[PDB]
Short mmCIF file of C-alpha atoms and ligand atoms in Angstrom, two decimals:
data_model
loop_
_atom_site.label_atom_id
_atom_site.label_comp_id
_atom_site.label_asym_id
_atom_site.label_seq_id
_atom_site.Cartn_x
_atom_site.Cartn_y
_atom_site.Cartn_z
CA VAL A 1 107.99 117.72 95.40
CA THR A 2 105.78 120.16 97.58
CA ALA A 3 106.89 119.69 101.25
CA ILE A 4 104.97 117.98 104.06
CA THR A 5 103.01 120.39 106.27
CA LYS A 6 103.08 120.26 110.10
CA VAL A 7 99.32 119.46 109.82
CA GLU A 8 99.75 116.24 107.75
CA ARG A 9 102.32 114.81 110.19
CA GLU A 10 100.11 115.36 113.24
CA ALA A 11 97.24 113.82 111.40
CA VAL A 12 99.23 110.61 111.34
CA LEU A 13 100.88 110.97 114.69
CA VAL A 14 97.61 110.75 116.58
CA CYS A 15 96.47 107.41 115.26
CA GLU A 16 97.02 105.11 118.21
CA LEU A 17 96.11 101.75 116.71
CA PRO A 18 94.32 100.13 119.62
CA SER A 19 94.30 96.29 119.49
CA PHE A 20 96.97 95.89 116.72
CA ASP A 21 100.36 94.18 116.77
CA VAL A 22 101.93 95.37 113.46
CA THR A 23 104.88 92.96 113.84
CA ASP A 24 102.58 89.92 113.83
CA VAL A 25 102.17 87.49 110.89
CA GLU A 26 98.37 87.53 111.49
CA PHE A 27 98.03 91.26 111.38
CA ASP A 28 95.01 92.35 109.31
CA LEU A 29 95.33 95.56 107.33
CA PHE A 30 91.74 95.26 106.05
CA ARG A 31 90.48 95.41 109.66
CA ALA A 32 92.87 98.34 110.36
CA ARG A 33 91.44 100.31 107.41
CA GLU A 34 87.83 99.64 108.55
CA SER A 35 88.55 100.62 112.16
CA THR A 36 88.49 104.39 111.36
CA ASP A 37 87.33 106.97 108.87
CA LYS A 38 90.90 108.04 108.10
CA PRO A 39 92.30 104.85 106.65
CA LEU A 40 95.13 106.59 104.85
CA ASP A 41 96.42 108.02 108.12
CA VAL A 42 96.19 104.62 109.80
CA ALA A 43 98.18 103.03 106.94
CA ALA A 44 100.86 105.74 107.32
CA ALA A 45 101.09 105.11 111.08
CA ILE A 46 101.51 101.37 110.50
CA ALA A 47 104.41 102.14 108.10
CA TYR A 48 105.87 104.64 110.54
CA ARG A 49 105.54 102.38 113.47
CA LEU A 50 107.09 99.50 111.70
CA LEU A 51 110.07 101.57 110.70
CA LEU A 52 110.65 102.93 114.26
CA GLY A 53 110.19 99.61 116.05
CA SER A 54 112.89 98.10 113.85
CA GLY A 55 115.48 100.47 115.41
CA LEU A 56 116.93 101.06 111.92
CA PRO A 57 116.20 104.65 110.83
CA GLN A 58 117.78 106.08 114.05
CA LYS A 59 120.96 104.02 113.45
CA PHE A 60 121.34 105.57 109.96
CA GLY A 61 120.75 109.23 110.88
CA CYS A 62 117.12 109.36 109.73
CA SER A 63 115.12 111.38 112.21
CA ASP A 64 111.52 110.62 113.08
CA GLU A 65 110.43 113.72 111.14
CA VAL A 66 112.26 112.84 107.86
CA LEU A 67 110.93 109.29 108.03
CA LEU A 68 107.38 110.46 108.30
CA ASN A 69 107.93 112.96 105.50
CA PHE A 70 109.11 110.23 103.21
CA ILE A 71 106.17 108.00 104.09
CA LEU A 72 103.74 110.87 103.29
CA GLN A 73 105.54 111.72 100.06
CA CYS A 74 105.16 108.07 98.96
CA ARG A 75 101.46 108.16 99.89
CA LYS A 76 100.82 111.27 97.78
CA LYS A 77 102.03 109.36 94.69
CA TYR A 78 99.80 106.27 95.07
CA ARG A 79 96.56 106.29 93.08
CA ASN A 80 92.99 105.26 93.91
CA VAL A 81 93.01 101.84 92.17
CA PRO A 82 91.68 98.53 93.60
CA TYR A 83 94.96 96.59 94.35
CA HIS A 84 98.14 98.62 93.53
CA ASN A 85 97.51 101.48 95.97
CA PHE A 86 99.15 102.66 99.19
CA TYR A 87 97.52 99.76 101.16
CA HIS A 88 99.32 97.25 98.95
CA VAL A 89 102.78 98.73 99.68
CA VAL A 90 102.17 99.17 103.41
CA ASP A 91 101.17 95.50 103.31
CA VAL A 92 104.44 94.58 101.55
CA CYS A 93 106.38 96.63 104.11
CA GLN A 94 104.63 94.91 106.99
CA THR A 95 105.05 91.49 105.41
CA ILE A 96 108.80 91.96 104.71
CA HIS A 97 109.12 93.06 108.38
CA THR A 98 107.69 89.68 109.37
CA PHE A 99 110.01 87.77 106.97
CA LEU A 100 112.98 89.63 108.39
CA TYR A 101 112.19 89.41 112.13
CA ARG A 102 109.86 86.44 112.61
CA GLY A 103 111.42 84.45 109.71
CA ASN A 104 114.97 85.39 110.79
CA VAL A 105 116.01 86.51 107.32
CA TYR A 106 117.66 89.48 109.05
CA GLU A 107 120.52 86.98 109.87
CA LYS A 108 121.43 86.93 106.18
CA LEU A 109 121.70 90.78 105.77
CA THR A 110 123.32 93.87 107.20
CA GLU A 111 121.23 96.37 109.15
CA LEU A 112 121.53 98.81 106.24
CA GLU A 113 120.10 96.18 103.86
CA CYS A 114 117.11 95.53 106.22
CA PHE A 115 116.43 99.27 106.35
CA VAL A 116 116.64 99.57 102.56
CA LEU A 117 114.17 96.72 102.08
CA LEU A 118 111.59 98.26 104.43
CA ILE A 119 111.93 101.59 102.62
CA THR A 120 111.89 100.01 99.21
CA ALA A 121 108.61 98.28 100.03
CA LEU A 122 106.97 101.71 100.14
CA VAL A 123 108.37 102.97 96.81
CA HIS A 124 108.09 99.85 94.68
CA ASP A 125 104.75 100.59 93.00
CA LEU A 126 104.73 104.42 93.00
CA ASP A 127 102.09 105.89 90.66
CA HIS A 128 100.65 102.49 89.52
CA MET A 129 97.44 103.16 87.49
CA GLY A 130 96.15 99.62 87.70
CA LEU A 131 97.58 98.53 84.36
CA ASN A 132 100.45 96.12 83.79
CA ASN A 133 103.51 96.39 81.54
CA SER A 134 101.76 94.43 78.84
CA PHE A 135 98.97 97.00 78.49
CA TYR A 136 101.46 99.86 77.81
CA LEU A 137 103.48 97.82 75.26
CA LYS A 138 100.74 96.31 73.13
CA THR A 139 98.65 99.56 73.10
CA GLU A 140 101.79 101.47 71.85
CA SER A 141 101.22 103.98 74.69
CA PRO A 142 103.81 106.76 75.16
CA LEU A 143 105.57 104.98 78.10
CA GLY A 144 105.37 101.74 76.13
CA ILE A 145 107.05 103.40 73.15
CA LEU A 146 109.69 105.04 75.37
CA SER A 147 110.52 101.70 76.98
CA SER A 148 110.63 99.86 73.64
CA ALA A 149 112.91 102.62 72.16
CA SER A 150 115.31 102.53 75.16
CA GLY A 151 115.65 98.67 75.14
CA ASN A 152 113.72 98.08 78.37
CA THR A 153 110.56 95.93 78.90
CA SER A 154 110.11 96.82 82.57
CA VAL A 155 107.96 99.82 81.72
CA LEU A 156 106.52 100.34 85.15
CA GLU A 157 109.40 99.31 87.33
CA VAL A 158 111.59 101.96 85.70
CA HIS A 159 108.83 104.54 86.34
CA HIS A 160 108.66 103.47 90.01
CA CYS A 161 112.43 103.92 90.41
CA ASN A 162 112.31 107.40 88.80
CA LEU A 163 109.72 108.59 91.33
CA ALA A 164 111.64 107.03 94.15
CA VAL A 165 114.73 109.02 93.15
CA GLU A 166 112.65 112.26 93.04
CA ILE A 167 111.36 111.75 96.59
CA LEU A 168 114.85 111.04 97.89
CA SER A 169 116.54 114.05 96.20
CA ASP A 170 114.64 116.39 98.65
CA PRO A 171 116.65 116.34 101.96
CA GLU A 172 113.44 116.76 104.03
CA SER A 173 112.26 113.32 102.72
CA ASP A 174 115.67 111.60 102.11
CA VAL A 175 115.70 108.71 104.50
CA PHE A 176 119.23 107.93 103.17
CA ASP A 177 120.68 111.41 103.88
CA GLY A 178 122.67 110.23 106.88
CA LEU A 179 124.60 107.80 104.69
CA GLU A 180 127.82 108.53 102.82
CA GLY A 181 130.17 106.97 100.33
CA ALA A 182 129.65 103.35 99.48
CA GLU A 183 126.76 103.03 101.97
CA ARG A 184 124.68 105.66 100.20
CA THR A 185 125.58 104.14 96.84
CA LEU A 186 124.60 100.68 98.05
CA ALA A 187 121.22 101.97 99.36
CA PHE A 188 120.37 103.43 95.95
CA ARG A 189 121.66 100.52 93.86
CA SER A 190 119.98 97.90 96.03
CA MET A 191 116.70 99.80 96.17
CA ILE A 192 116.68 100.10 92.40
CA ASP A 193 117.81 96.50 91.79
CA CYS A 194 115.00 95.20 94.05
CA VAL A 195 112.31 97.28 92.36
CA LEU A 196 113.46 96.19 88.89
CA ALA A 197 113.34 92.57 90.11
CA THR A 198 109.59 92.78 90.90
CA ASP A 199 108.83 92.64 87.15
CA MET A 200 106.99 89.26 86.91
CA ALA A 201 108.42 88.61 83.46
CA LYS A 202 111.76 88.13 85.28
CA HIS A 203 110.24 85.75 87.89
CA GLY A 204 111.88 82.45 86.86
CA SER A 205 115.32 83.85 86.22
CA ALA A 206 115.49 85.87 89.48
CA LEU A 207 114.38 82.76 91.39
CA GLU A 208 116.93 80.55 89.60
CA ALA A 209 119.73 83.04 90.24
CA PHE A 210 118.86 83.27 93.95
CA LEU A 211 118.81 79.44 94.31
CA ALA A 212 122.04 79.01 92.38
CA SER A 213 123.78 81.60 94.62
CA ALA A 214 122.39 79.98 97.81
CA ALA A 215 123.48 76.47 96.74
CA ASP A 216 127.05 77.75 96.16
CA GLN A 217 129.36 78.25 99.17
CA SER A 218 131.74 80.22 96.89
CA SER A 219 129.12 82.65 95.70
CA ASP A 220 130.22 86.23 95.78
CA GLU A 221 128.95 87.55 99.04
CA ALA A 222 127.74 90.94 97.76
CA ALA A 223 125.80 89.23 95.01
CA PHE A 224 124.10 86.76 97.46
CA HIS A 225 123.07 89.68 99.77
CA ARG A 226 121.72 91.48 96.75
CA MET A 227 119.80 88.45 95.50
CA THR A 228 118.37 87.81 98.92
CA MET A 229 117.03 91.41 99.03
CA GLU A 230 115.53 90.92 95.60
CA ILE A 231 113.95 87.63 96.59
CA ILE A 232 112.49 89.11 99.76
CA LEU A 233 110.92 92.03 97.92
CA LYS A 234 109.52 89.57 95.41
CA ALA A 235 108.32 87.32 98.23
CA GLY A 236 106.56 90.26 99.89
CA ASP A 237 104.93 91.09 96.58
CA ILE A 238 103.40 87.62 96.07
CA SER A 239 102.75 87.13 99.80
CA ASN A 240 98.91 87.40 99.70
CA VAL A 241 98.47 83.59 99.64
CA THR A 242 100.68 83.24 102.77
CA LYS A 243 98.12 85.17 104.90
CA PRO A 244 95.16 84.02 106.95
CA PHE A 245 92.53 82.86 104.41
CA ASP A 246 90.14 85.77 104.90
CA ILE A 247 92.91 88.30 104.37
CA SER A 248 94.14 86.31 101.41
CA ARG A 249 90.67 86.23 99.87
CA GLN A 250 90.06 89.97 100.19
CA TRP A 251 93.42 90.55 98.42
CA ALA A 252 92.39 88.14 95.63
CA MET A 253 89.13 90.12 95.15
CA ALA A 254 90.96 93.47 94.83
CA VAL A 255 93.49 92.07 92.30
CA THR A 256 90.71 90.45 90.26
CA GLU A 257 88.79 93.73 89.97
CA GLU A 258 91.98 95.48 88.85
CA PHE A 259 92.73 92.86 86.20
CA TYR A 260 89.10 93.15 85.01
CA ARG A 261 89.37 96.96 84.55
CA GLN A 262 92.51 96.46 82.46
CA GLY A 263 90.57 93.84 80.42
CA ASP A 264 87.76 96.39 79.89
CA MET A 265 90.28 99.05 78.73
CA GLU A 266 91.90 96.44 76.41
CA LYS A 267 88.45 95.63 74.92
CA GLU A 268 87.80 99.34 74.28
CA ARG A 269 91.20 99.83 72.56
CA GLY A 270 90.60 96.77 70.36
CA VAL A 271 93.63 94.82 71.60
CA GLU A 272 93.97 91.27 72.98
CA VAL A 273 92.44 90.50 76.35
CA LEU A 274 93.63 87.53 78.28
CA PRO A 275 91.20 85.14 79.85
CA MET A 276 92.16 86.15 83.38
CA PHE A 277 91.57 89.82 82.62
CA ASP A 278 88.14 89.09 80.98
CA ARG A 279 85.13 90.20 83.18
CA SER A 280 82.66 88.16 81.05
CA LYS A 281 84.29 84.71 81.62
CA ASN A 282 84.00 85.28 85.42
CA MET A 283 86.51 82.43 86.10
CA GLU A 284 86.04 81.44 89.78
CA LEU A 285 88.27 83.04 92.42
CA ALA A 286 88.93 79.64 93.99
CA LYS A 287 90.38 77.90 90.92
CA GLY A 288 92.37 81.09 90.36
CA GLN A 289 93.90 80.92 93.81
CA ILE A 290 94.64 77.19 93.54
CA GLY A 291 96.27 77.73 90.15
CA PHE A 292 98.39 80.64 91.48
CA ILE A 293 99.33 78.49 94.43
CA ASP A 294 100.32 75.48 92.26
CA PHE A 295 102.21 77.15 89.43
CA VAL A 296 103.71 80.30 91.14
CA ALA A 297 103.52 80.66 94.97
CA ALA A 298 104.01 77.16 96.45
CA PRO A 299 107.07 76.30 94.29
CA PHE A 300 108.56 79.77 94.98
CA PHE A 301 108.14 79.66 98.71
CA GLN A 302 109.05 75.97 99.10
CA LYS A 303 112.21 76.43 97.02
CA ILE A 304 113.50 79.52 98.93
CA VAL A 305 112.65 78.02 102.31
CA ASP A 306 114.46 74.78 101.37
CA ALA A 307 117.40 76.55 99.77
CA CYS A 308 118.18 78.71 102.81
CA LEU A 309 115.26 80.66 104.43
CA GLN A 310 114.25 77.93 106.95
CA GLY A 311 112.54 80.39 109.35
CA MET A 312 109.95 81.26 106.68
CA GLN A 313 108.43 77.71 106.91
CA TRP A 314 105.07 79.16 108.05
CA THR A 315 104.55 80.69 104.64
CA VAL A 316 104.69 77.24 103.04
CA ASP A 317 102.32 75.86 105.78
CA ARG A 318 99.86 78.73 105.31
CA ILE A 319 99.89 78.23 101.53
CA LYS A 320 99.05 74.49 102.08
CA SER A 321 96.38 75.39 104.63
CA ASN A 322 94.91 77.93 102.16
CA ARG A 323 95.01 75.60 99.16
CA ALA A 324 93.16 72.92 101.19
CA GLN A 325 90.64 75.54 102.36
CA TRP A 326 90.05 76.47 98.62
CA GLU A 327 89.49 72.75 97.86
CA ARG A 328 86.81 72.72 100.65
CA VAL A 329 85.10 75.63 98.90
CA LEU A 330 85.19 73.44 95.75
CA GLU A 331 84.18 70.13 97.40
CA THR A 332 81.11 71.89 99.00
CA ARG A 333 80.09 74.14 96.11
C1 CVL B 1 95.76 87.54 95.71
O1 CVL B 1 96.07 86.74 94.57
C2 CVL B 1 96.99 87.21 93.67
C3 CVL B 1 98.02 88.08 93.95
C4 CVL B 1 98.90 88.47 92.95
C5 CVL B 1 98.76 87.99 91.65
C6 CVL B 1 99.69 88.36 90.58
N1 CVL B 1 99.97 87.53 89.64
N2 CVL B 1 100.58 88.24 88.64
C7 CVL B 1 100.77 87.55 87.33
C8 CVL B 1 101.51 88.42 86.32
C9 CVL B 1 101.47 86.23 87.58
C10 CVL B 1 100.93 89.50 89.03
O2 CVL B 1 101.54 90.35 88.41
C11 CVL B 1 100.45 89.67 90.46
C12 CVL B 1 101.65 89.74 91.42
C13 CVL B 1 99.56 90.91 90.59
C14 CVL B 1 97.73 87.08 91.37
C15 CVL B 1 96.84 86.70 92.36
O3 CVL B 1 95.80 85.84 92.12
C16 CVL B 1 94.84 86.20 91.12
C17 CVL B 1 94.28 84.92 90.54
C18 CVL B 1 94.20 84.83 89.02
C19 CVL B 1 94.86 83.60 88.45
O4 CVL B 1 96.26 83.69 88.77
C20 CVL B 1 97.15 82.87 88.12
C21 CVL B 1 98.34 83.43 87.69
C22 CVL B 1 99.29 82.66 87.04
C23 CVL B 1 99.05 81.31 86.81
C24 CVL B 1 100.05 80.49 86.12
N3 CVL B 1 99.85 79.31 85.56
N4 CVL B 1 101.05 78.91 85.06
N5 CVL B 1 101.95 79.80 85.30
N6 CVL B 1 101.34 80.80 85.96
C25 CVL B 1 97.85 80.75 87.24
C26 CVL B 1 96.90 81.53 87.89
MG1 MG B 2 104.80 96.30 90.76
ZN1 ZN B 3 103.65 95.29 94.30
#
């Protein structure tokens, strides 16, 4: 990958972020973007700041300069789509920071594991084009065909891991370079395992496996740590409904537009479009959000909080608050 110029780093290093506490659960990335004309640089400074304030990169021999190089190499590989862009993964990074440090999930993991999660947040959607796995498979696209031939349904998640490995193979962006032996191996394996676990087709089984490990005092310890990392990355990924309503809404708008574009490309290729992806049916945002809350997010968050992540209670409270606020949009429509 072409290296990161002295210019690009300074461009990020000057953003001062007046008014913002990046470690806060009520932090607003939409307002951060809008507060300058160089949103990409602001996003990179949020990432950078979050990583330094954690104290983690320094402990694992990752200099300030290598960190920032990695962040900018990730940025370069995110596309200009509505939802799955660099803002999404900075969001996931920031959110996982809050689950670790304000939800006390750090108590369940080593420092190395916390560092790997924060890093993995930034790689976990590399080069997303705004189309899901399903699009690639049922259009018999080249990546679809390659995944089907190699016995793998997680079309995109495999692609994300490949690009992550490229970035890390350059020592000037290898945030794991200061590791050795089993620690370096664990960083790679856990990064890759987490990214593979974000495939939503695996949602139920990854959740069941996490809960089964947590309920069991004789669970293998390495496996529990691993499942917890996976569950946290997944939690960060479906975390939009745990945010202040206005933030949550703006996320739901961006996702909806992305799904609609896929539905338009499906239409053009003469393949099945799902209701949700269909721009014509215009199914209301609010019922969408309530449905997502009822069938996916509330059960997920309630079950992991109950099972062992007690400090993440606020997520369940904010989901309830948001559901009730969507009902008030319905009741007064
Ligand atoms: C901001 O709101 C959303 C954020 C993320 C998502 C996603 N859902 N999915 C699908 C595959 C489950 C994804 O891959 C991501 C993570 C992008 C959806 C969001 O809300 C959009 C609202 C559209 C309606 O959403 C649903 C989705 C699933 C169900 C359902 N019913 N039964 N089982 N699942 C209902 C509504
Ligand atoms: Mg993804
Ligand atoms: Zn994601």
